[PDB]
Amino acid sequence: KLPPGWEKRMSRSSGRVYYFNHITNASQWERPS
């Protein structure tokens, strides 16, 4: 399970998975802590 704010997303252009944080609008390739 992911920390508050994060959701798993999928890149529509590369097909890769990434994480987006609704609270801080941060996004990153690596699953957060």
Coordinates of all heavy atoms in Angstrom, one line a residue, unseen atoms left out:
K1 N 0.8 -1.2 0.0 CA 0.0 0.0 0.0 C 0.9 1.3 0.0 O 1.9 1.3 0.6 CB -1.0 0.0 1.2
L2 N 0.4 2.3 -0.7 CA 1.1 3.5 -0.9 C 0.8 4.6 0.1 O -0.4 4.7 0.6 CB 0.8 4.1 -2.3 CG 1.2 3.4 -3.6 CD1 0.5 3.9 -4.8 CD2 2.7 3.6 -3.8
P3 N 1.7 5.5 0.4 CA 1.5 6.6 1.4 C 0.3 7.5 0.9 O 0.0 7.5 -0.3 CB 2.8 7.4 1.4 CG 3.8 6.5 0.8 CD 3.1 5.6 -0.2
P4 N -0.2 8.3 1.8 CA -1.3 9.2 1.4 C -0.9 10.2 0.2 O 0.3 10.6 0.2 CB -1.6 10.1 2.6 CG -1.2 9.1 3.7 CD 0.0 8.4 3.2
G5 N -1.8 10.4 -0.8 CA -1.5 11.3 -1.9 C -1.1 10.6 -3.2 O -1.3 11.1 -4.3
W6 N -0.4 9.5 -3.0 CA 0.2 8.8 -4.2 C -0.8 8.0 -4.9 O -1.7 7.3 -4.3 CB 1.3 7.9 -3.8 CG 2.5 8.7 -3.3 CD1 2.8 9.0 -2.0 CD2 3.5 9.4 -4.1 NE1 4.0 9.8 -1.9 CE2 4.4 10.0 -3.2 CE3 3.7 9.5 -5.5 CZ2 5.5 10.8 -3.6 CZ3 4.8 10.3 -5.9 CH2 5.7 10.9 -5.0
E7 N -0.7 7.9 -6.3 CA -1.4 6.9 -7.0 C -0.5 6.4 -8.1 O 0.3 7.1 -8.6 CB -2.8 7.3 -7.6 CG -2.7 8.5 -8.6 CD -3.9 8.4 -9.6 OE1 -4.4 7.3 -10.0 OE2 -4.2 9.5 -10.0
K8 N -0.7 5.1 -8.4 CA 0.1 4.4 -9.5 C -0.5 4.9 -10.8 O -1.7 5.0 -11.0 CB -0.1 2.9 -9.4 CG 1.2 2.2 -9.7 CD 1.2 0.7 -9.4 CE 0.9 -0.1 -10.6 NZ 1.0 -1.5 -10.3
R9 N 0.3 5.4 -11.7 CA -0.2 5.8 -13.0 C 0.5 5.0 -14.1 O 1.5 4.3 -13.9 CB 0.0 7.3 -13.2 CG -0.3 8.1 -12.0 CD -1.6 8.8 -12.0 NE -1.9 9.1 -13.4 CZ -2.6 10.2 -13.8 NH1 -3.0 11.0 -12.8 NH2 -2.9 10.3 -15.1
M10 N 0.0 5.2 -15.4 CA 0.8 4.6 -16.5 C 1.0 5.7 -17.5 O 0.1 6.3 -18.0 CB 0.0 3.5 -17.0 CG 0.8 2.7 -18.0 SD -0.2 1.4 -18.6 CE -1.4 2.3 -19.6
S11 N 2.3 5.8 -18.0 CA 2.6 6.6 -19.1 C 2.0 6.2 -20.4 O 2.1 5.1 -20.9 CB 4.1 6.6 -19.3 OG 4.4 7.3 -20.5
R12 N 1.2 7.1 -21.0 CA 0.5 6.9 -22.2 C 1.4 6.8 -23.4 O 1.0 6.4 -24.5 CB -0.6 8.0 -22.4 CG -1.8 7.5 -23.1 CD -2.9 8.7 -23.2 NE -2.3 10.0 -22.8 CZ -2.4 10.6 -21.6 NH1 -3.0 10.0 -20.6 NH2 -1.8 11.8 -21.5
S13 N 2.6 7.3 -23.3 CA 3.5 7.4 -24.4 C 4.6 6.3 -24.4 O 5.0 5.8 -25.4 CB 4.2 8.8 -24.4 OG 5.3 8.8 -23.6
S14 N 5.1 6.0 -23.2 CA 6.1 4.9 -23.1 C 5.6 3.6 -22.5 O 6.3 2.6 -22.6 CB 7.3 5.4 -22.2 OG 6.8 5.4 -20.8
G15 N 4.4 3.6 -22.0 CA 3.9 2.4 -21.4 C 4.4 2.0 -20.0 O 4.0 1.1 -19.4
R16 N 5.3 2.9 -19.5 CA 5.9 2.6 -18.2 C 5.0 3.1 -17.1 O 4.1 3.9 -17.2 CB 7.3 3.2 -18.1 CG 8.3 2.5 -18.9 CD 9.6 3.3 -19.1 NE 10.2 3.6 -17.8 CZ 10.8 4.8 -17.5 NH1 10.9 5.7 -18.4 NH2 11.3 5.0 -16.3
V17 N 5.2 2.5 -15.9 CA 4.5 2.8 -14.7 C 5.2 4.0 -14.0 O 6.4 4.2 -14.1 CB 4.3 1.6 -13.8 CG1 4.1 1.9 -12.4 CG2 3.1 0.8 -14.3
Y18 N 4.5 4.8 -13.3 CA 5.1 5.9 -12.5 C 4.1 6.3 -11.3 O 2.9 5.9 -11.3 CB 5.4 7.1 -13.4 CG 4.3 7.9 -13.9 CD1 3.7 8.9 -13.2 CD2 3.8 7.7 -15.2 CE1 2.6 9.6 -13.6 CE2 2.7 8.3 -15.7 CZ 2.1 9.3 -14.9 OH 1.0 10.0 -15.4
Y19 N 4.6 7.2 -10.4 CA 3.7 7.5 -9.3 C 3.5 9.0 -9.3 O 4.4 9.7 -9.6 CB 4.4 7.0 -8.0 CG 4.5 5.5 -8.0 CD1 5.6 4.9 -8.6 CD2 3.4 4.7 -7.6 CE1 5.7 3.5 -8.8 CE2 3.5 3.3 -7.8 CZ 4.6 2.7 -8.3 OH 4.7 1.4 -8.5
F20 N 2.3 9.4 -9.0 CA 1.9 10.8 -8.9 C 1.3 11.1 -7.6 O 0.5 10.3 -7.1 CB 0.9 11.1 -10.0 CG 0.4 12.6 -10.0 CD1 1.2 13.6 -10.5 CD2 -0.9 12.9 -9.5 CE1 0.7 14.9 -10.4 CE2 -1.4 14.2 -9.5 CZ -0.5 15.2 -10.0
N21 N 1.7 12.2 -7.0 CA 1.2 12.6 -5.7 C 0.2 13.7 -5.8 O 0.6 14.9 -6.2 CB 2.4 13.1 -4.8 CG 2.0 13.3 -3.4 OD1 1.0 13.9 -3.1 ND2 2.8 12.7 -2.5
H22 N -1.0 13.5 -5.5 CA -2.1 14.5 -5.6 C -1.8 15.6 -4.6 O -2.2 16.8 -5.0 CB -3.4 13.9 -5.4 CG -3.8 12.9 -6.5 ND1 -4.2 13.3 -7.7 CD2 -3.6 11.5 -6.6 CE1 -4.4 12.3 -8.5 NE2 -4.0 11.2 -7.8
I23 N -1.3 15.4 -3.5 CA -1.0 16.5 -2.5 C 0.1 17.4 -3.0 O -0.1 18.6 -2.9 CB -0.7 15.9 -1.1 CG1 -1.7 14.9 -0.6 CG2 -0.4 17.0 -0.1 CD1 -1.2 14.0 0.5
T24 N 1.2 17.0 -3.5 CA 2.3 17.9 -3.8 C 2.5 18.1 -5.2 O 3.4 18.8 -5.6 CB 3.6 17.4 -3.1 OG1 3.9 16.1 -3.7 CG2 3.4 17.3 -1.6
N25 N 1.6 17.5 -6.1 CA 1.8 17.4 -7.5 C 3.2 16.9 -8.0 O 3.6 17.1 -9.1 CB 1.5 18.7 -8.2 CG 0.1 19.1 -8.1 OD1 -0.8 18.3 -8.4 ND2 -0.1 20.3 -7.7
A26 N 3.9 16.2 -7.1 CA 5.2 15.6 -7.4 C 4.9 14.3 -8.2 O 3.8 13.8 -8.0 CB 6.0 15.3 -6.1
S27 N 5.8 13.9 -9.0 CA 5.6 12.6 -9.7 C 7.0 12.0 -9.8 O 8.0 12.8 -9.9 CB 5.0 12.8 -11.1 OG 6.0 13.3 -12.0
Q28 N 7.1 10.7 -9.9 CA 8.4 10.1 -10.0 C 8.3 8.7 -10.6 O 7.2 8.1 -10.5 CB 9.1 10.0 -8.6 CG 8.3 9.3 -7.6 CD 8.9 9.4 -6.2 OE1 9.1 10.5 -5.7 NE2 9.2 8.2 -5.7
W29 N 9.4 8.1 -11.1 CA 9.4 6.8 -11.7 C 9.4 5.7 -10.7 O 8.8 4.6 -10.9 CB 10.6 6.6 -12.7 CG 10.5 7.6 -13.8 CD1 11.3 8.8 -14.0 CD2 9.6 7.6 -14.9 NE1 10.9 9.4 -15.1 CE2 9.9 8.8 -15.7 CE3 8.6 6.7 -15.4 CZ2 9.2 9.1 -16.9 CZ3 7.9 7.1 -16.5 CH2 8.2 8.2 -17.3
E30 N 10.0 5.9 -9.5 CA 10.2 4.9 -8.5 C 9.1 4.9 -7.5 O 8.7 6.0 -7.0 CB 11.6 5.1 -7.8 CG 12.7 5.8 -8.6 CD 12.6 7.3 -8.6 OE1 12.5 7.9 -7.5 OE2 12.6 7.9 -9.7
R31 N 8.5 3.7 -7.1 CA 7.5 3.6 -6.1 C 7.9 4.2 -4.8 O 9.0 3.9 -4.3 CB 7.2 2.1 -5.9 CG 6.2 1.8 -4.7 CD 5.8 0.3 -4.8 NE 4.4 0.2 -4.1 CZ 3.3 -0.1 -4.8 NH1 3.3 -0.3 -6.1 NH2 2.2 -0.2 -4.1
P32 N 7.1 5.2 -4.2 CA 7.6 5.9 -3.0 C 7.6 5.0 -1.8 O 6.8 4.1 -1.6 CB 6.6 7.0 -2.9 CG 5.4 6.6 -3.6 CD 5.8 5.7 -4.7
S33 N 8.6 5.2 -0.9 CA 8.9 4.4 0.3 C 7.9 3.4 0.7 O 7.0 3.6 1.6 CB 9.1 5.4 1.5 OG 7.9 6.1 1.8

